[PDB]
Amino acid sequence: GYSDRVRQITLGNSTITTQEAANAVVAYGEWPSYLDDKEANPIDAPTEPDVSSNRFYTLDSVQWKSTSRGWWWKLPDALKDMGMFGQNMYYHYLGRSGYTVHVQCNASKFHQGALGVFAIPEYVMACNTEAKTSYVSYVNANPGEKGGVFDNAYNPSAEASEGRKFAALDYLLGCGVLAGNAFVYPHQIINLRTNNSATLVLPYVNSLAIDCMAKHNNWGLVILPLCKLDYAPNSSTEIPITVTIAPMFTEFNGLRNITVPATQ
Amino acid sequence: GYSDRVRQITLGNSTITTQEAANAVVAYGEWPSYLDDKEANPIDAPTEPDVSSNRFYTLDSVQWKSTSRGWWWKLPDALKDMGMFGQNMYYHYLGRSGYTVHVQCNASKFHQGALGVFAIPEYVMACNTEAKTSYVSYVNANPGEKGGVFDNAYNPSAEASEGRKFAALDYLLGCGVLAGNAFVYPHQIINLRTNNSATLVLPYVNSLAIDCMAKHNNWGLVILPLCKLDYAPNSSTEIPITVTIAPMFTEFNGLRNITVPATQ
Amino acid sequence: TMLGEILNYYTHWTGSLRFTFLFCGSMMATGKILLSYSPPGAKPPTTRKDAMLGTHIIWDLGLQSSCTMLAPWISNTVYRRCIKDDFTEGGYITCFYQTRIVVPSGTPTSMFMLAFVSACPDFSVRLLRDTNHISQRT
Amino acid sequence: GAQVSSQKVGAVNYTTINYYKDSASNAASKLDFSQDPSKFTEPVKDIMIKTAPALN
């Protein structure tokens, strides 16, 4: 009865079902966990918000078209305005979190296409001016739940002030490496003939036990069309991709007044 | 060495000291606690924010003058905009909390005066129009950290629409009972010759295990000058009264989107 | 509903409510649907991003035809009243496309689902009363 | 022939004697908490395990 294709995930007051999964990935074979006393750093008693924040948040959906070049988000950035997770994040200097990432994309037995879904630690991307290096604004680096898109062209700006955004060039993974090698990162593929969802469980990954969430994204989430969407009755059709992410084993230190980042 | 006058209270990242206390009151002899399984009601796993919210929040100070008639606050209303406590309160349908209330008022060995400090369960107060009964607006009932003041005169409104506030008449305790009997409620007195602070530890009190914090205040906090402030070199002098309150054993159920109450 | 009719012979109710949905499109139709229960006291949800902050389930359409969403017992009072009443309000149930329903050609592009309600084993009622659902002339 | 039984709790026993020769004369039947909702909610021939697929 039980199947690699059928799964339920419950976190807090939220549940996901899928009937066309393809197993699930646990990044680097490690489930998330709380921070042990023998690896701890800040000494204040941490806040562990548990069910208030460790639950599925669904981002705004994006549309997959035959011409789409792909999508990216950063974490914890994409969830910074999500319910109590966002509040706990911004009221504290320090935070750590794992995640369950559930990417959703159904179609029909007559559609075709394949999405690579990658979780990338320290997903540093190229800037869009050749007058400077590492020249990206905080606002452009941290788009929140809307994330960003890849392009198949690189057109760096005439003036440095206009190029302070990522050059998200698809085939170089926005960072000067070949996209065909992205499979070294934890990943699944949503191949429409096979499955309609990808599930990745991510431990906290960093060179520190805990860090400043508002300064530093631990993971990138990349969705790249490896094989373009095609549908014979209408090649211009679009199908939604929906991203739903739950923080897990969240832990926060250094409580004070709320952080309100710059918006422009 | 140890003394009824000298106390330290630590909750979360916050500590209070006093060197001229007068013991401390534990209302009805009961320390606050979490809700037991055998008395529970809502069945979702609760959020217990612990140190993020169970900590001392200091309200705006008020000025005690020879002419002051007194001050009131409601709880959890007075703390509704306080850090993570406020966030947890408003993101949930249900909440319960105990409190440590620490009222602070120092002067000198040459000043005199006495404040009654009372914690009143279900502190229902009279309205200020005789055209209606029980006719008080949500906004006027829930002033937040600014609280309200008592008056020594009752002047109900000419029109019902203008009297939708409390008639906080001091000697009737704003509710038709004689203020001299307020001592049946958990209380201390700040008598300037003796002490400079009052400390009251309050359990959750209600006819239910847990309730809607945004609808219902469980406790009133009343500060009444029983003997007027006097200071011979300047009878018009004013001394601050500062109220600092820590939620304790907070527990919340029924997570959803955030409650944003009407402001006018 | 059958539950509603039984409740109208009682004054008080308590417990969890089960909402089961049966998708009745063609086998070729796929989709993901979000079903949510938001306990009361906040802005009623009219968008998916508010609804998903409450208790919810994401239903993937497939071979298993039906999905159950629970409104778990989450209440201030130990019983709610079997009348419209602000004090014992129960909250908000909503539903949104999580992705969308997708069909291939030669397939109906509009279809239906059926919603069912039932009480859970934690459910009970009190205080027998006459119903307002039956009457006669005199 | 007195029967002593537990009362329904209020905010603990009571006594009953039957005075009549016909059981039809008796007061209400004692609380019967019997139930088997599954004869209406799950009257299926083959057992369905919740955690399993309903159709396999």
């Binding site: 339920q8 | - | 417990g15 298993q64 999905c67 159950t68 | 399993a52 309903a54």
Partner: peptide, 27 residues
Amino acid sequence: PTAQSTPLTSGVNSQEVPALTAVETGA
């Protein structure tokens, strides 16, 4: 006899899917 008590449970990530059924069965 009482109505059902609620057990302490956390979350799951599992091939057990009690949220899905098929009411065509008559259940």
